[PDB]
Coordinates of C-alpha atoms and ligand atoms in Angstrom, one line a residue:
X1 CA 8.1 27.7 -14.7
X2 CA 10.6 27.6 -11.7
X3 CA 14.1 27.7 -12.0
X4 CA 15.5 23.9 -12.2
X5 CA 18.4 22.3 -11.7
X6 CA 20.3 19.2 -12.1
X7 CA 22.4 16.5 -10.0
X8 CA 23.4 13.0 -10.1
X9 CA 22.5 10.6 -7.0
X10 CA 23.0 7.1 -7.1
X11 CA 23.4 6.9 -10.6
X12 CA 20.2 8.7 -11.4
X13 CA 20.1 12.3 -12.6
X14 CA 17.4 14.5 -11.4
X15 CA 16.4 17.4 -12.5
X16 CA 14.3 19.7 -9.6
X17 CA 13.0 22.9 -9.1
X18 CA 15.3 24.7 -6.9
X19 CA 12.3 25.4 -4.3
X20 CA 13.6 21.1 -3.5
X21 CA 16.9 20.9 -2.0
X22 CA 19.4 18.5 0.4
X23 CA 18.0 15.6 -1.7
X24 CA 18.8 12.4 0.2
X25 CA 18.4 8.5 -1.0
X26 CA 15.7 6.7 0.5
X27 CA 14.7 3.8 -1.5
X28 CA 15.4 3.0 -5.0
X29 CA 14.2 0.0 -7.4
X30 CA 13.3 -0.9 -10.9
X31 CA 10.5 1.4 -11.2
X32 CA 11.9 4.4 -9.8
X33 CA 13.6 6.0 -7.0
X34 CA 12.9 8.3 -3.8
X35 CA 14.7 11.1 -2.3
X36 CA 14.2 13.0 0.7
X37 CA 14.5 16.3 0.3
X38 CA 13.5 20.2 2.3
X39 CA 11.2 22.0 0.7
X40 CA 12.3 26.0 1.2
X41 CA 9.0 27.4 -0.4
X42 CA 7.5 25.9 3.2
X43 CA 10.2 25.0 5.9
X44 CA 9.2 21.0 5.6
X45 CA 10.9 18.0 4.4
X46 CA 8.9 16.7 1.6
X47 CA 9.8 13.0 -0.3
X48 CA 10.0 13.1 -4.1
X49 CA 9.7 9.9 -5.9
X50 CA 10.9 9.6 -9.5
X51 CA 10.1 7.3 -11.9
X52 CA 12.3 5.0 -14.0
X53 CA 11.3 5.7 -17.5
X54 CA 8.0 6.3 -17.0
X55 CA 6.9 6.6 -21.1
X56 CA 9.7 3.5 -22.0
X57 CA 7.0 0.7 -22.4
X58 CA 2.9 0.3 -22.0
X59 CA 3.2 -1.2 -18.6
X60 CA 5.5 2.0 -17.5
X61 CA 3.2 4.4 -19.3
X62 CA -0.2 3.2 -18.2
X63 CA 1.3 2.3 -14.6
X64 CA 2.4 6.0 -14.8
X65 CA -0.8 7.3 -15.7
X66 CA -2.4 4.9 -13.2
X67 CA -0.5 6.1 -9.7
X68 CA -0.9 10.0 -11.1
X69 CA -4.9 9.9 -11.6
X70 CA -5.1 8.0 -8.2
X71 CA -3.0 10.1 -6.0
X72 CA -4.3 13.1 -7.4
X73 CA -8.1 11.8 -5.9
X74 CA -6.8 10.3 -2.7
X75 CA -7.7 13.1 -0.1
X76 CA -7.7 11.5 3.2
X77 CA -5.6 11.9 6.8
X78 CA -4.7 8.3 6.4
X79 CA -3.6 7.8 3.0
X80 CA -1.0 9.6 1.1
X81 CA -1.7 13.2 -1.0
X82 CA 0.3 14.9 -3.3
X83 CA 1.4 18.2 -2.7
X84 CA 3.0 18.8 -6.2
X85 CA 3.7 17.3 -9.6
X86 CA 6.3 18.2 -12.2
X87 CA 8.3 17.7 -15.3
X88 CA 11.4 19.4 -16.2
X89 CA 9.7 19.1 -20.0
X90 CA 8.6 22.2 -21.5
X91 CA 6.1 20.8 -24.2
X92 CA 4.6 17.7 -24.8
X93 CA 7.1 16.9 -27.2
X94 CA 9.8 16.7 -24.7
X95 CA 8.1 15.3 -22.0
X96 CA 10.7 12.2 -20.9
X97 CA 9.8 12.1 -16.9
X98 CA 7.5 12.5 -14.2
X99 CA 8.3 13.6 -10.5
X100 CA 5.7 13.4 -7.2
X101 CA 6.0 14.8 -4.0
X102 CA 4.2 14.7 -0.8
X103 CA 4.9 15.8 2.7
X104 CA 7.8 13.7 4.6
X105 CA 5.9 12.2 7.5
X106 CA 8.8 9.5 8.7
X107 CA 7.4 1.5 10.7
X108 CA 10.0 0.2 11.6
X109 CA 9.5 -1.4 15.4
X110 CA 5.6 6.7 18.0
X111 CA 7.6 5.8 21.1
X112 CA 6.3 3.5 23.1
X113 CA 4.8 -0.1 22.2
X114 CA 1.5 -0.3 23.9
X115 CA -1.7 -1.8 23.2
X116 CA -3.0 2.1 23.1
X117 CA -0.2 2.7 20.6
X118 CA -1.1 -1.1 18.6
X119 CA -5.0 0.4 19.1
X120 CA -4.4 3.5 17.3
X121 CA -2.3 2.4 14.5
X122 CA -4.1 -0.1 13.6
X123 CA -7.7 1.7 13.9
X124 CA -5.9 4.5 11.3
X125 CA -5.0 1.6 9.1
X126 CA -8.7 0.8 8.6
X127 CA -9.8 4.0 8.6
X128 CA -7.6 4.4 5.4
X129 CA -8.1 1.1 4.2
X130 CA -12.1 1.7 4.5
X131 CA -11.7 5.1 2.1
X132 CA -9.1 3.5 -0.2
X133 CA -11.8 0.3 -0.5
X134 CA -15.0 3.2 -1.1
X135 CA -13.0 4.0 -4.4
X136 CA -13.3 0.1 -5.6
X137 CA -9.6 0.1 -5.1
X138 CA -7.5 -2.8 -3.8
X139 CA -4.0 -2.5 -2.3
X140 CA -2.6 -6.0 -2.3
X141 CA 1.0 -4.4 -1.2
X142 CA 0.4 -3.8 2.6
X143 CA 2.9 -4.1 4.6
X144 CA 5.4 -2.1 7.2
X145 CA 7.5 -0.9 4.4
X146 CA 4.2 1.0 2.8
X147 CA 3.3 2.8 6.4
X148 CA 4.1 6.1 7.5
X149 CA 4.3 7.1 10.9
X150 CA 5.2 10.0 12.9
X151 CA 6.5 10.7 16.3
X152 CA 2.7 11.3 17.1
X153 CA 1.9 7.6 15.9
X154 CA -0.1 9.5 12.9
X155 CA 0.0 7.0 10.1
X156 CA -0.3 7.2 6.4
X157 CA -0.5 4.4 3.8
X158 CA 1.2 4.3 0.7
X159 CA 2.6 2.1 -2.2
X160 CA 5.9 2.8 -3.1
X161 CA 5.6 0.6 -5.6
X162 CA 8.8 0.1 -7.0
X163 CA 9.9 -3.6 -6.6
X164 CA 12.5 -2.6 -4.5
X165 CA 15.2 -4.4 7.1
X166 CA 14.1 -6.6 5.0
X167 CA 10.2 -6.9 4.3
X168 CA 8.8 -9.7 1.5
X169 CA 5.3 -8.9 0.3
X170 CA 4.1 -12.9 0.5
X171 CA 4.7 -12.6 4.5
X172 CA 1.6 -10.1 4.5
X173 CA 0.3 -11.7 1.2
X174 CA -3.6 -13.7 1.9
X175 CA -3.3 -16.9 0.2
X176 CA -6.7 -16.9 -2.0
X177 CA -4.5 -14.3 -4.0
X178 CA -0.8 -15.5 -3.4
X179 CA -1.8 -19.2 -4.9
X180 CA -4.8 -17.9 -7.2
X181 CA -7.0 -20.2 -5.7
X182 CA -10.4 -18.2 -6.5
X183 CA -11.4 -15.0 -7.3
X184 CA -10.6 -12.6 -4.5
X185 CA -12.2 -9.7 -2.7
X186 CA -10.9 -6.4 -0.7
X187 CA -10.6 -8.3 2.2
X188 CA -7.4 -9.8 1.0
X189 CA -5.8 -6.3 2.5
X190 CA -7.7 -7.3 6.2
X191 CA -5.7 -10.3 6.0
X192 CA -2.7 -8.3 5.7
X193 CA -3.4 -6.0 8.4
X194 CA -4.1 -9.0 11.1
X195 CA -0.6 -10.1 9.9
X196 CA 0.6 -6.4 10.9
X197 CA -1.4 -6.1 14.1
X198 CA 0.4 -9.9 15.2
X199 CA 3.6 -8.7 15.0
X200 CA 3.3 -5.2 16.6
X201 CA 1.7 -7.4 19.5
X202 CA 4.3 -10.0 19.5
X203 CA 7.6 -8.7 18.7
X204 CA 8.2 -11.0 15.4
X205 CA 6.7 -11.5 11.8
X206 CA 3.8 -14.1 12.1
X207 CA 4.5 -15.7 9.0
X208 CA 8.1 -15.2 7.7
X209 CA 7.9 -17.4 4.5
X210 CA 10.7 -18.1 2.3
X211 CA 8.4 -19.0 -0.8
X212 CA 4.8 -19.6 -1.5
X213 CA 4.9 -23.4 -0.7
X214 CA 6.9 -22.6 3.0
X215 CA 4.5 -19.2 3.5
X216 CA 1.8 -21.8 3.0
X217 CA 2.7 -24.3 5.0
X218 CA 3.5 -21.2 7.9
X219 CA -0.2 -20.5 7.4
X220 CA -2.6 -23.6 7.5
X221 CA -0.5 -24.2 11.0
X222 CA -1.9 -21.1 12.8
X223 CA -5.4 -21.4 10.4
X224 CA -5.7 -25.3 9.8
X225 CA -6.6 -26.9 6.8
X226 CA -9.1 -25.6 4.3
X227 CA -12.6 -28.0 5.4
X228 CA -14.8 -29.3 2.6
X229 CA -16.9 -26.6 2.6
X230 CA -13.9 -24.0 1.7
X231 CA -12.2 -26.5 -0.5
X232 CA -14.5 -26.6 -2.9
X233 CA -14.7 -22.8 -2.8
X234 CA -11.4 -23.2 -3.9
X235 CA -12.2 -23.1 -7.7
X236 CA -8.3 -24.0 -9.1
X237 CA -8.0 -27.9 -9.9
X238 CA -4.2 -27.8 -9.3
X239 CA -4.4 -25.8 -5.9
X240 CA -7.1 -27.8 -4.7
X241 CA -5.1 -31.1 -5.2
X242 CA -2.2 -29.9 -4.0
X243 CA -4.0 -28.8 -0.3
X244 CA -5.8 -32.1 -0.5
X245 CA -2.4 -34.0 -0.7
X246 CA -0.9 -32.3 2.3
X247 CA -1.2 -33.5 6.0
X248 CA -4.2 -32.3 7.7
X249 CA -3.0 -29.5 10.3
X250 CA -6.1 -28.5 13.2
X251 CA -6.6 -24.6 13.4
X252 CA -4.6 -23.5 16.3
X253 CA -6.4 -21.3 19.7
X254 CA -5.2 -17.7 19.1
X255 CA -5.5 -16.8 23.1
X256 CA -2.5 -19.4 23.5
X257 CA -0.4 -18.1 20.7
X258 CA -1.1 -15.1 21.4
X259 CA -1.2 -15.2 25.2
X260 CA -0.8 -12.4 27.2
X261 CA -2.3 -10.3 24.7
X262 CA -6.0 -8.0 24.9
X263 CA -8.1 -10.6 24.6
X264 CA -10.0 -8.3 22.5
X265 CA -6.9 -7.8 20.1
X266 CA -6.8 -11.8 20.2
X267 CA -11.1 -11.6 19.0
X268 CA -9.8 -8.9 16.3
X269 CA -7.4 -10.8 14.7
X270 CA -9.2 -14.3 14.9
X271 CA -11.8 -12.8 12.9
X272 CA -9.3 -11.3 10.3
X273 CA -6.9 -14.3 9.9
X274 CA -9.4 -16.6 8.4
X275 CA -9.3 -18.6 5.0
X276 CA -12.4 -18.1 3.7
X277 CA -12.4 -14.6 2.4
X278 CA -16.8 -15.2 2.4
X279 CA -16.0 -14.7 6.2
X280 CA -13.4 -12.6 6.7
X281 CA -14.1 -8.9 8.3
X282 CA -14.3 -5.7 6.5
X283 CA -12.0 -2.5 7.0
X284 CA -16.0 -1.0 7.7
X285 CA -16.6 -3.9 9.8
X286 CA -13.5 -3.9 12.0
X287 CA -13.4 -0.3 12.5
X288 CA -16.5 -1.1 14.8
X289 CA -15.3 -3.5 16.8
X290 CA -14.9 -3.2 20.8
X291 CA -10.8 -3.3 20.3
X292 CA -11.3 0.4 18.9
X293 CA -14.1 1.6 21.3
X294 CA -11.8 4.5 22.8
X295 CA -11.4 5.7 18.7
X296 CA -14.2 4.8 16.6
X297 CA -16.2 7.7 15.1
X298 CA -18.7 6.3 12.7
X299 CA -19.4 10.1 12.3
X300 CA -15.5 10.3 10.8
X301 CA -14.5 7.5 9.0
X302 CA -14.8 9.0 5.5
X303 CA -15.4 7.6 2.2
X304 CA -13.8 8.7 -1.1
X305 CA -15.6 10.8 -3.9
X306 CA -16.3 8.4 -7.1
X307 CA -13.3 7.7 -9.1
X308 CA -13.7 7.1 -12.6
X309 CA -11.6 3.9 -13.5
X310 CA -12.9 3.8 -17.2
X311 CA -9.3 4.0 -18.2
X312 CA -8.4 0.7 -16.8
X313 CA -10.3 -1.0 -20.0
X314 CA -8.6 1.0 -22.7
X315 CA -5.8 -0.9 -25.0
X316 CA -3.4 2.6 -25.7
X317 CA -0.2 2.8 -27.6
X318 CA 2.8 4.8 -25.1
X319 CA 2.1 8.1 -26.8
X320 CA -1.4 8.4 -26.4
X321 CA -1.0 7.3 -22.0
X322 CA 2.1 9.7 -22.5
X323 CA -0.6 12.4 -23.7
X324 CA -3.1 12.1 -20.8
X325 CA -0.3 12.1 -18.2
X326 CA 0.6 15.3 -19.3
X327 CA -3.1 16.3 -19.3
X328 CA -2.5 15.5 -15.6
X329 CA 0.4 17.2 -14.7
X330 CA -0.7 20.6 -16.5
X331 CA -4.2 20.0 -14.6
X332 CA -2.6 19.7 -10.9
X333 CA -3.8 22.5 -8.8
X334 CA -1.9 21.9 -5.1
X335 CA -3.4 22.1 -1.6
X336 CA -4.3 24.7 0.6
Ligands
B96_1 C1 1.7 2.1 -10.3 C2 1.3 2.6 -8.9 C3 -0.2 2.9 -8.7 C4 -0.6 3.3 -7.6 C5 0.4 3.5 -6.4 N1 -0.2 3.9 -5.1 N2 -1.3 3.4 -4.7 C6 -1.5 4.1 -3.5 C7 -2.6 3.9 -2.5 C8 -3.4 2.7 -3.0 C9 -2.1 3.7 -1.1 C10 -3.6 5.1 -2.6 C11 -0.4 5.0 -3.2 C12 0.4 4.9 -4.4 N3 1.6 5.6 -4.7 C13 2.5 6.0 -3.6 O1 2.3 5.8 -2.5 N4 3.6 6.7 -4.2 C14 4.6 7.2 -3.4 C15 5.2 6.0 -2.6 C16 6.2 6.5 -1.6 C17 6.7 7.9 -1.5 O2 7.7 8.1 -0.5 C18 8.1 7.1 0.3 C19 8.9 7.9 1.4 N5 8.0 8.2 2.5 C20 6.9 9.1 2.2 C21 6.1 9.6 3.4 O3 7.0 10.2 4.4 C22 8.0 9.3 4.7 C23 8.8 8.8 3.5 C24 6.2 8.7 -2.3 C25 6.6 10.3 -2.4 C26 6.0 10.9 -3.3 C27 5.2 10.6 -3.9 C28 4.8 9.6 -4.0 C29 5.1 8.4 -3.3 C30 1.6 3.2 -6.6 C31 2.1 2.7 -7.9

């Protein structure tokens, strides 16, 4: 067991291992915090993220358990890993918090802006999003705020997942899952990536919504009006009425809102910024389109190991998801 120590930042004690030092603020909210920090066991800046009470309340403890069993598997150049785990606890009986680090690779619109640049991050995107999809997990958080990037335009996705330059989730949000109009697939993250890839090729957020009912509205004026035959794919009684009620809006041509743009980029996102999530593309899908020709590797687009989500269905009292995150945190054996 390392030497720890503690401080206070922001109102917020931590308590480190002294290997994790110059811990700086970068983003805090009500379900934890992170801190920048240097790592002097290595020479690199690492990110630690605490969370708020982890063991407080079943949501916090099985949300806890949750992100710890998933970051542990993810293992992929394009999606976060975890390079350590710890509690200051010595037993089990003790055991109050949980701390998670990974390696400080930091969008915020890589140097230069051009459609190579748009290209590669986006292919990167769907290269993660295709592994993070092969585990039968959904995002439903993408946005700017949950990429890393570095000066090499490398990218990462995370979640920081702690309801935290400001960036609302329902602009990036598809609206089969923002309204609950139906039940939803993985393509609901697609949709947020064409609403990433539009911005990075126009300068501004496509659909900067100030509620669901305005972010709606924003939408069916690019996309047009659900037709009959998505409408009544659109299994909700009250959402259904409430699109019928609305004034008919045509679908707009993407190669004159988007003009000036690779007309294959214009191709890429027409096919996914669609309603009907029957039609919309896949990560797998996308990843072999022409736009990416000058990346695509269907030799090394990898997919995730199995990853046992049995735990999902089990009703648990806080001390017995507080016993298998420990399970976890004794268990963690770090990179090479
Ligand atoms: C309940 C819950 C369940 C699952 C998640 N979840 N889901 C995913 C997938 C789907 C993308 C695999 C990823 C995560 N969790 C995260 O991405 N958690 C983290 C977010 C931001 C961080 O640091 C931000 C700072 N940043 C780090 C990179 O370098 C630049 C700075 C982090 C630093 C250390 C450790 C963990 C971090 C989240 C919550």
């Amino acid at each position: 067991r390392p030497t720890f120590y503690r401080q206070e930042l922001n109102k917020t004690i931590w308590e480190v291992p002294e290997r994790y030092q110059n811990l700086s603020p970068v983003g805090s909210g009500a379900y934890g915090s992170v801190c920048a920090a240097f790592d002097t066991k290595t020479g690199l800046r690492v990110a630690v993220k605490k969370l708020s009470r982890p063991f407080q309340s079943i949501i916090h403890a099985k949300r806890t358990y949750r992100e710890l069993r998933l970051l542990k598997h993810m293992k992929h150049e394009n999606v976060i890993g975890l390079l350590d785990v710890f509690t200051p606890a010595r037993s089990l009986e003790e055991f109050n918090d949980v701390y998670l680090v990974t390696h400080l690779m930091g969008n915020n619109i890589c140097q230069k802006l051009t459609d190579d640049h748009v290209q590669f991050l986006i292919y990167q995107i769907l290269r993660g999003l295709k592994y993070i999809h092969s585990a039968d997990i959904i995002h439903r958080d993408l946005k700017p705020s949950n990429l890393a990037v570095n000066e090499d335009c490398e990218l990462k996705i995370l979640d920081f997942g702690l309801a935290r330059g400001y960036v609302a989730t329902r602009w990036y949000r598809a609206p089969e899952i923002m309204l609950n109009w139906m039940h939803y697939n993985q393509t609901v993250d697609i949709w947020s990536v064409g609403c990433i890839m539009a911005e990075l090729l126009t300068g501004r957020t496509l659909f900067p919504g100030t509620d669901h009912i305005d972010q709606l509205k924003l939408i069916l004026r690019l996309v047009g009006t659900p037709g009959a035959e998505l409408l009544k794919k659109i299994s909700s009684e009250s959402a259904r009425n409430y699109i019928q009620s609305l004034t008919q809006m045509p679908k707009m041509n993407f190669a004159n809102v988007f003009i000036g743009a690779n007309p294959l980029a214009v191709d890429l996102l027409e096919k996914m910024l669609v309603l009907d999530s029957d039609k919309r593309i896949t990560a797998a899908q996308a990843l072999a389109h022409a736009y990416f020709a000058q990346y695509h590797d269907p030799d090394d687009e990898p997919v995730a190991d199995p990853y046992d989500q049995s735990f999902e269905s089990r009703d648990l009292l806080i001390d017995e998801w507080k016993s298998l995150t420990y399970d976890e945190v004794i268990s963690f054996v770090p990179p090479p």
